[PDB]
Design a protein around this ligand. Structure first.
Ligand code: ZN
Ligand code: ZN
Ligand code: ZN
Length: 88
DNA sequence: AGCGTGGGCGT
DNA sequence: TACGCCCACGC
C-alpha cells in the first residue's frame, strides 16, 4: 500500500493513498468547515458528517436493534454496534 | 445515551 | 472531483 499524498503541515507526517483523503485530513489543521446545515446553520468539516447530523433534526433512526423484544433504534450504524455489543 | 469528528475505505 | 459507508474514540 503506497501513500503518495503527504501532509506537510508543521509537525505532521500523515500520508494518504488518495488526494481527497489528504484534503479532508488537512481541514483538521485549517479549521475549514465547507458544509452547512440548512436547518440550524451549524457548519461541518465533512459532508458525510453533515448528513448524519441532519438526522438529529428529524429523529430518523435507520438502524434497528435486532434483539428479541428490544425496540431501540439508532441514527448511525456505530451506535447500533455499541448497542448490540452491550446486549452481548 | 446521542452525536461531534477524527480514522479507514468503496464506488 | 462527487456521493456514500463502517470503525471507533471522546465528551
Ligand atoms: Zn496533517
Ligand atoms: Zn443542523
Ligand atoms: Zn436492543
Amino acid at each position: 500500500s503506497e501513500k503518495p499524498y503527504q501532509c506537510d503541515f508543521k509537525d505532521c507526517e500523515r500520508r494518504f493513498s488518495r488526494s481527497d483523503q489528504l484534503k479532508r485530513h488537512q481541514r483538521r489543521h485549517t479549521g475549514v468547515k465547507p458544509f452547512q446545515c440548512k436547518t440550524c446553520q451549524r457548519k461541518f468539516s465533512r459532508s458525510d458528517h453533515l448528513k448524519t447530523h441532519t438526522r438529529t433534526h428529524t429523529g430518523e433512526k435507520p438502524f434497528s436493534c435486532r434483539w428479541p423484544s428490544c425496540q431501540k433504534k439508532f441514527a448511525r450504524s456505530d451506535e447500533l454496534v455499541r448497542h448490540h455489543n452491550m446486549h452481548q
